[PDB]
């Protein structure tokens, strides 16, 4: 089932479930840059107008993408040797809603095949994304720690600026869990930290993405 691959040059991404009980589905293409972790996707609905901020698909619309340091990341690595990762991701946000994604990836060649599944409950209907009023996101260090062989653990805060610039604030954490045993050498670098920046331009039914990511042993 599972084939040897290559370091990705494009993908594709279908990100799909509910926010609050009401159905989205996104479908669309992507390329991005395996020597320093840039990433470019579109989306389209397929059920149309979404009823929420399209902000709040982001992060979570590739890691495969991230190189490290010396070499490429395990995320890298695990698409090229086609044995690949699944991943869990819980977010919280100071309000009370709640987000998780659960995503498969199949490889073929250099391009790459994203299932997204979202599920986002108790987000207030006056509250900035059920109002559409999110406009950006910060930076965002992102504390990568390996707990075993198969396991990587990401932690980070997130905060969006809204239309009248406060902060709607979360947190994340998200687990990789690798079909097989990544290499010792990354054992041994703990913790990884990585940078990165997200743009959104989108209308209700559309959006192109961005994203810089750089990672440091630091
Ligand atoms: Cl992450």
């Known amino acids: ?84 990762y699944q991943v869990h991701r819980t977010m919280q946000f100071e309000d009370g809603a709640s987000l998780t994604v659960n995503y498969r990836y199949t490889y073929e060649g250099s391009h790459i095949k994203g299932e997204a599944q979202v599920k986002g409950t108790g987000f207030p209907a006056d509250g900035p994304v059920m109002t559409n009023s999110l406009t950006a996101a910060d930076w965002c260090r992102s504390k990568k720690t390996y707990p075993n062989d198969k396991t990587i653990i990401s932690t980070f805060k997130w905060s969006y600026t809204t239309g009248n610039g406060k902060r709607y604030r979360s947190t994340a954490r998200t687990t990789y869990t690798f079909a097989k045993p990544m290499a010792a050498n990354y054992l041994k670098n703990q913790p990884m930290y990585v940078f990165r920046k997200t743009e959104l331009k989108h209308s209700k039914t559309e959006l192109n993405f961005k994203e810089w990511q750089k990672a440091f042993t630091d």
């Not at 293409?29 to 709040?56: A, H, M, V």
Request: aromatic content about 10%; proline content about 8%; hydrophobic content about 35%.
């Open 1 to 84: 089932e599972d084939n040897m691959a290559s370091l990705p040059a494009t993908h594709e991404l279908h990100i799909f479930g509910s926010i609050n009980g009401v159905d989205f589905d996104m479908v669309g293409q992507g390329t991005g840059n395996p020597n320093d972790g840039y990433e470019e996707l579109n989306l389209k609905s397929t059920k149309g107008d979404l009823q929420f901020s399209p902000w709040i698909l982001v992060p979570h619309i590739f890691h495969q993408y991230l190189p490290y340091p010396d070499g490429m990341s395990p995320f890298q690595a695990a698409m090229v040797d086609g044995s690949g």
